[PDB]
């Protein structure tokens, strides 16, 4: 376990504890995203930009279909998915799993494609088709709302030639928004790591419409969405009607047993007439009594849990482990140069503060609370006095649960470090030169 | 304190010198953003999308008010003339809080004194049907309401309420609200774990108003000539002080600081130039920007700061430490400066400071126009200084340059220096090097 | 030069080989962006918002003119000839950009000669003739929005305070602008600014610009994604509020005897534990010289690596030895996640860690067993053709290297930790050990 008592003397006070949940058990829903809007109502003077748009869109979609055919021509039946590796050549584990999922989805892709004429004839933003007697499919048209709302009503008021330039500019803008996602960046269409946010760029970035039409099956939906846990996969691309069918995955957040997130709040502390701040990861994964880092920038942090669409556990150095579980002499520290570093923090109703670097006094007696040059921070609680003042704040305090003699015992301190990108190279160079 | 001559001979030519300023002394203005639009003029056949959007917005806005109530329930005015007589904090009922979070809590209570008065206007705030509205708060005070989706409704849906089928207007609306929510979730969604703090930029806040912060700031007022600055450096910040789940409108206190230039504090930029040594090209690895204040030399993490032509602007004192060896290197101990071998052919090879030209004439062909002959660099000179004493007009490829006179040593080009050890700065190189030294130590 | 057989043993399965091509030989074209719309049709409800927008845009554009005028005032014919005394601080890129700016003034004079024509444009794209032979296109920022929404609605409503909507539209446009042409912009001289960023003055619609300019290359998408198509500001006008941009359209020139090799990572067992090796995913080989590349800046395709600049960086000598057969110098990292790839296929040949994923090939009708001394188990049609892993049944080809692959062992490198705090902790521990 983490020893929070010695960690608070270093400047790391306990924060919230959070439960770790990962994406798992994903359901499947199939939708149709039509990249080319229906322009039947505006075709009388749509100009020649429709053909140019079609050619440009082929220029984008053709590599996607080409990369899909590599798996399309290598999946068949021999019971289950039967792969042929000679004609594949280069593929990762994720690519092979995506190919198996692709062949699975081909069974419903055939039935969806059986309604090609219905798919092409769609002229609403969200259209319902009866793909079979007991199941339906939704069709989303990329720019159909724009055409029905702005361009179609203004087909005779504004100059149509101007309408021709408008429609064009709209197409262009849609293509420009697409190309960040569906352009040559999409080297591997056989993948399910692509978020619904990116796929919705084929619909104007409006993933809310897609998901709401599909259905908010779970109460953890927002955490799934922000974590981009709702992923998708392209399973069929048509170069004749310019549509792609996407199998959206709707998973459930599975609480990982015997696992939690611990967050530590850094507090600047005083040592040798200077301010220092200790460098440890702000967040720690503890799973089955094993301590390991957690790339968190990708995860989503809530007040009670940390939601990750992948298991982002990353290794911890033994030295960092020891530092977190008591050996504070191994905890590195960096000198403070920012006038705006945190100086106090509230944990469990009790305050740990550096009262030599900040104004520090008590409300119930009016007297100042003095910090010596030997001690790093102060535990202020109702025992010393039940209300403290730190500049403009007046704070009533609660009891402490740890040692009664917290402020009368000192600890050892670690070595100074510098965490700049260039500082790493210089320290390596000097250490190498020192060794030589 | 920086010795420019040895830096130049290594390849760190002089750059511009800029002052250091920080956000300071923030004035406050209070506004409200109604995250729900008034659909009264087009409510005839809006359908049920209004209710569903209501529930979705309630679901998103509920955690914000839940986090705010942790401070609201626990904030109170301490009694009697003994202390500054401000706000008391039920710290045991708060549990977990940082210095910045508590500070924001205090500013939240402070703003409550005005937020109660603005909440008296609840019926007026509901009645707003324009994208910007001004309201009287008192006979000597005013407040602004911004409608999240009023411009779109009033410009497209109301005029086109009959020319198209009403069902189509239903979809369009639904799509518009869903687009709003999708743009919103990046800021006001579950990413917003701490709404109490005031570190959130006005650009992020404007996402609740369609990303149009320029309207927020213009309507409030261009208080100073530095306006673009406090804007880009993320110095203009706002705080949510009251969330209402019945009218779906939040009150935001916008902060307009003033930029205090720090005295005895300037930012120096160094230009790197590839230099020849041991029959190969190298580039030194030093910070491009260095902060020297109170004769003290420290780095700066300028990525979050704004580098204008004359000053470096930061919404926070972003000064960071610098290694002792880097201080000695920038002081003159030039052998402690690291250098990186360059394999790219697109690294700059010459630079101009004070009108004197530093160049690597081994890598790039140099000749002088006045004498019509080549400018030669020998194998033991890292860089060649060219100035009017050398010749008043030299060329480097396709550029004709006229040079001024040097201010330092007259015999610059005849004096050599020591050179440091090579380094490699790839992400995997650091791990590879650390293993090598560890194995060497064992 | 890369020993792929030995790299497979450490988890680096050989992947796709791609061809390296860099930006070179840029053509030049001239466009004019007028960053304020012409509203002569809706001058009725333009109200006063336009004067405030004029002031705001003048304040925005003044530093750009100031930072161009340093080279405007200090360059003259004496080819291109420049005054370095009054310029003072300048980089190689800045000097080259100023030279190109001077070359562009020759056409900039003729372009400015049509100032009245430029300011009279009332569409998003209008064709103008600067000479008897050459033509120029002019792009106005919000003319489409105006002509499609505000113009029709001006008689479809009693103005309904159109100001409120025009003001907001111009405000949103300026909010979009401030990210690129706002304070951030410090060196408008340099030509490293991408056409995507330039199009923010036109609403981010770079596709219209590139289509109207008439691209005529098959590498157009690779040019656009790799940030190869850049622009340069050559003149600013504060009276009509338009700027001239010289768009550079380059061509992809393949670097001879150069290719980039991709390594696919696969977890491997060692000492009853699972590791992943820390080696760059993409490796550039040029004339039998091996160097790294920050491939995040470039674009990766199925058959080529496209960068707008030569992004080669040096590699440690030890890493070079690691990638050339001596596997003991290759660092490895412990795998504390359950979502690391565990198998990969190379040349129809499967590499997998059968300890961590169950293997039972259907042709033999039995499980595939990996000992406690084999990092990866290699399967091909020589052992049994079709293998099954989890839910995939895959048929396999034949290996081309050593037939005795599974029987030979190798040495393994030392563990590493790649977190930034881990690096600092390792540095501190090594320093303390030295002391």
The b/e string for B398-412 (b: 16+ C-beta within 10 A; e otherwise) is ebbbbbbebeeeeeb
* Chain A residues with CB-CB distance to C349 below 8 A: 85
CB contact under 8 A, B102 and A344: yes
Phi first, then psi: give them for residue A101, nearest 5 degrees.
-60, -35
Contact predicate C12/C122, CB 8 Å:
no
- Measuring CA to CA, which residue among B330, B11, B249, B432 is closest to residue C279? B432
Strand partners, B399: B396
Chain C, window 323-352: residues with a beta carbon less than 8 angstroms from a chain A beta carbon: 333-334, 336-339, 341-350
Chain A CB contacts of C396 under 8 Å are 85-86
Q: In angstroms, rounded to a whole number, what is the distance separating the alpha carbons of residues A270 and A250?
A: 50
Report how far apart the first and last C-alpha atoms of chain A are (Å, whole number): 40
Q: What is the dihedral of CA B102, B107, B110, B112, to 10 degrees?
A: -90
Q: Is the CB of B435 less than 8 angstroms away from the CB of C331?
A: yes
- Token pair recorded at residue C300: 């990766």
Spatial separation of the C-alpha atoms in residues C47 and C41, rounded to whole Å? 13
Query: In Å, how far is C68's CA from the nearest CA of chain B?
Result: 13
Question: Hey, is the C-beta of C146 within 8 angstroms of any chain A C-beta?
Answer: no
Which of C90, C312, C416 is nearest residue B343 as measured by Cβ atoms?
C312
Residue A307 CB neighbour total at 10 angstroms: 23
B123, B151 Cβ separation under 8 angstroms: no
Which residues of C fall within a CB distance of 8 Å from A319?
425-426, 428-429
Q: How close, in Å, is residue B411 to chain A by CA atoms?
A: 31
The answer to whether A283 touches A260, Cβ cutoff 8 Å, is no
> What is d(CA A137, CA B114) in angstroms, rounded to the nearest whole number?
52
Question: Best residue in C296, C304, C392 to probe A by mutation, most A CBs within 10 Å?
Answer: C392
Nearest CB partner across the interface for C428, out of A67, A97, A415? A415
What is the Cα–Cα distance from C435 to C432, expressed in whole angstroms?
A: 5
Q: Quick one: resolution in A?
A: 3.2
Q: Are A347 and B96 inside 8 Å of each other by CB?
A: yes
- Residues in C closer than 8 angstroms to B308, CB to CB, are 183, 186
Residue of A145, A393, A423 with shortest CB distance to B171: A145
Cα–Cα distance, A58 to A47 (Å, whole number): 19
The rounded distance, in Å, linking the Cα atoms of B8 and B341 is 17
Q: Determine which of B401, B407, B442 to mutate to test the interface with C (most C C-beta atoms within 10 Å).
A: B401
Interchain pair B340, C184: CB under 8 A: no
Contacts of B321 in chain A (CB under 8 A): 334-335, 337, 418, 420, 423
Q: What six digits make up the tokens of B437?
A: 């030294």
- Alpha-carbon distance of A198 to A207, in angstroms, equals 9
Residue A181 to residue A164: CA distance in whole angstroms: 27
| Experimental determination technique | cryo-EM
Listed in order, strand segments (DSSP E) in A230-289 are 231-232, 234-238, 243-266, 269-271, 274-278, 283-287
Q: Is B218 on the interface with C (CB under 8 A)?
A: yes
Whether residues B95 and A346 touch (CB distance < 8 A) is answered with yes
C431 touching B (Cβ < 8 Å) = no
For residue C32, give how far its alpha carbon lies from the nearest alpha carbon of chain A (Å).
17
Strands C80-83 and C75-77: antiparallel
Looking only at the bridges linking them, the beta strands covering B87-90 and A393-396 are parallel
Between residues 37 and 66 of chain C, which touch chain A (CB distance below 8 Å)?
Answer: none
Structural contact between residues A215 and A254, judged by C-beta atoms closer than 8 angstroms: no
Q: Which among B95, B178, B326 has CB closest to A212?
A: B178
Give B291 to chain A, closest Cα distance, Å: 11
- DSSP state for residue A266 in the 8-state scheme: E
Chain C interface includes B10 (CB < 8 A) = no
B182–A contact, CB cutoff 8 A: yes
Closest residue on chain B to C179 (Cα): B232
Question: Positive or negative CA dihedral for A244, A247, A253, A256?
Answer: negative
Interface of C with B in 183-202 (CB under 8 A): 183-184, 186
Among the partner-chain residues C82, C289, C414, the one whose CB lies closest to the CB of B402 is C82
Report the Cα–Cα distance between both ends of chain C, in Å, rounded: 41
CA distance A275 to A336: 5
Q: Flag whether residue B16 sits within 8 Å of chain C, measured between CB atoms.
A: yes
The answer to whether B423 contacts chain C (CB < 8 Å) is: no
Ramachandran assignment for B204, one of left (phi > 0), alpha (psi -120 to 50 degrees), beta (any other): alpha
Instruction: Please judge whether A427 and C426 are an interchain contact, meaning their C-beta atoms are less than 8 angstroms apart.
Output: no
- Asked if residue C41 lies in contact with residue C261, where contact means CB atoms within 8 angstroms, the answer is no
Question: Which of A209, A266, A385, A386 is most worth mutating to test chain B (most B CB atoms within 10 A of its CB)?
Answer: A209
Q: For chains B and C, what is the number of CB pairs under 8 angstroms?
A: 195
Nearest CA to CA, how far is B351 from chain C (Å)?
Answer: 5
Among candidates B82, B430, B433 on the partner chain, residue whose Cβ is nearest the Cβ of A366 = B82
Is B370:B392 a contact under the CB 8 Å cutoff? Answer: yes
- In angstroms, the separation between the Cα of residue B427 and the nearest Cα of chain C is 9
Chain C residues within 8 A of A172 when measuring between CB atoms: 205, 207-208, 211
Residue of B nearest to A349 (CA): B92
Contacts of B22 (CB under 8 A, 6+ apart): B259, B260, B262, B313, B314, B315, B316, B317
What are the C-alpha distances in Å from C141 to residues A95, A387, B9, C181, C340? Answer: 43, 60, 48, 14, 47
Phi, psi of B294 (to 5 degrees): 55, 40
Question: Do B273 and B349 touch, CB atoms closer than 8 A?
Answer: yes
Whole-number Å distance between alpha carbons of C274 and C282: 23
B neighbours by CB contacts (3+ pairs under 8 Å): A, C
Q: Please classify residue A193 by burial: count the beta carbons closer than 10 Å to its beta carbon, then call 0-12 exposed, 13-18 middle and 19+ buried.
A: middle
Shortest Cα distance, chain A CAs vs residue B274, angstroms: 18
Q: Looking at beta carbons, which residues of chain A come within 8 Å of B60?
A: 222
CA distance B87 to C270: 61
**Binary contact (C204, A173; C-beta < 8 A):** yes
- Beta pairing partners, B393: B402
Asked if B88 has any chain A CB less than 8 Å from its own CB, the reply is: yes
- Cα–Cα distance for residue pair C226/C22, rounded to 1 Å: 10
Substitution target from B314, B346, B357 for chain C, most C beta carbons within 10 A: B346
Q: CA-based angle B40:B45:B46, to the nearest 5? A: 65
- Whole-number Cα distances in Å, B353 to A332, B277, B390, B404: 40, 22, 16, 10
Q: Angle formed by the axes of helices B166-188 and B49-72, to 10°?
A: 20
Cβ–Cβ < 8 Å for A82, C396: no
Contact B352 C434 (CB under 8 A): no
Chain A residues 264-293 within an 8 A CB cutoff of chain B: 265
For A8-78, strand residue ranges (E) read 12-34, 75-77
Candidates B232, B340, B345; nearest CB to C310: B345
């Amino acid at each position: 376990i983490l020893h929070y008592e010695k960690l608070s003397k270093i400047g790391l006070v306990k924060g919230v504890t959070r439960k770790y949940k990962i994406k798992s058990n994903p359901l499947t829903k199939d939708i149709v995203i039509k990249m080319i809007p229906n322009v039947s109502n505006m075709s009388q003077c749509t100009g020649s930009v429709m053909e140019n748009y079609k050619t440009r869109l082929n220029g984008i979609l053709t590599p996607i279909k080409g990369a899909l055919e590599i798996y399309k021509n290598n999946t068949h039946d021999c019971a289950g998915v039967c792969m042929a590796g000679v004609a594949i050549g280069i593929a990762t584990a994720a690519q092979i799993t995506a190919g198996v999922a692709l062949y699975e989805a081909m069974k419903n892709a055939d039935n969806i494609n059986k309604l090609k004429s219905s798919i092409e004839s769609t002229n609403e933003a969200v259209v319902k088709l009866q793909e079979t007697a007991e199941k339906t499919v939704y069709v989303f048209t990329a720019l159909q709302d724009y055409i029905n709302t702005n361009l179609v009503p203004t087909i005779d008021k504004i100059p149509c030639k101007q309408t021709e330039l408008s429609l064009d500019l709209a197409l262009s803008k849609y293509l420009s928004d697409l190309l960040f996602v569906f352009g040559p960046n999409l080297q591997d269409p056989v993948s399910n790591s692509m978020t619904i946010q990116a796929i919705s760029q084929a619909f104007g970035g409006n993933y809310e419409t897609l998901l709401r039409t599909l259905g908010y099956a779970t109460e953890d939906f927002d955490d799934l969405l922000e974590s981009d846990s709702i992923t998708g996969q392209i399973i069929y691309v048509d170069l004749s009607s310019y549509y792609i069918i996407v199998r959206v995955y709707f998973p459930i957040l599975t609480e990982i047993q015997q696992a939690y997130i611990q967050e530590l709040l850094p507090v600047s502390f005083n040592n040798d007439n200077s301010e220092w701040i200790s460098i440890v990861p702000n967040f720690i994964l503890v799973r089955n009594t094993l301590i390991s880092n957690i790339e968190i920038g990708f995860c989503l942090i809530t007040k009670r849990s940390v939601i990750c669409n992948q298991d982002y556990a990353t290794p911890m150095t033994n030295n960092m482990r020891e530092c977190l579980t008591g050996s504070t002499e191994k905890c590195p520290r960096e000198l403070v140069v920012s006038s705006h570093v945190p100086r106090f923090a509230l944990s469990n109703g009790v305050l740990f503060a550096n009262c030599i670097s900040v104004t520090c006094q008590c409300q119930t007696t009016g007297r100042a609370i003095s910090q010596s040059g030997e001690q790093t921070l102060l535990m202020i609680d109702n025992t010393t006095c039940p209300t403290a003042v730190l500049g403009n704040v007046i704070i009533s305090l609660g009891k402490y649960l740890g040692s009664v003699n917290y402020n009368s015992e000192g600890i050892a301190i670690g070595p100074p470090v510098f965490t700049d990108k260039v500082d790493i190279s210089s320290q390596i160079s000097s250490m190498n030169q020192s060794l030589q």
